[PDB]
Amino acid sequence: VGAXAXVXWXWXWXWX
Amino acid sequence: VGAXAXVXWXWXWXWX
Ligand SMILES: [Cl-]
Ligand SMILES: [Cl-]
Ligand SMILES: [Cl-]
Ligand SMILES: [Cs+]
Ligand SMILES: [Cs+]
Ligand SMILES: [Cs+]
Ligand SMILES: [Cs+]
């Protein structure tokens, strides 16, 4: 739920 | 870690 795949913005986990 | 901002692939939480 929200839109896309899994959780947040991105590929992975954290920022970069 | 990974590449991006978060956890996963994209925007929010889940599949869509
Ligand atoms: Cl969704
Ligand atoms: Cl995601
Ligand atoms: Cl990341
Ligand atoms: Cs999603
Ligand atoms: Cs992410
Ligand atoms: Cs996470
Ligand atoms: Cs789900």
CA distance A11 to A3: 14
Contact status, residue A6 vs residue B10, Cβ threshold 8 Å? yes
Could you give the angle at the alpha carbon of A13 between the alpha carbons of A6 and A7, nearest 5°? 20
Give Cα B12 to chain centroid, integer Å: 7
- How close is the nearest chain B Cα to the Cα of A4, in Å? 4
Residues of B in contact with A2 (CB under 8 A): 11-14, 16
Q: Which of A1, A4, A15 has its CB closest to that of B10? A: A4
Contact status, residue B12 vs residue A6, Cβ threshold 8 Å? no
Instruction: Give the amino acid at B6.
Output: X
Residues of B in contact with A7 (CB under 8 A): 6-8, 12-14
Would you tell me how many other CB atoms lie within 10 Å of the CB of residue A7? 17
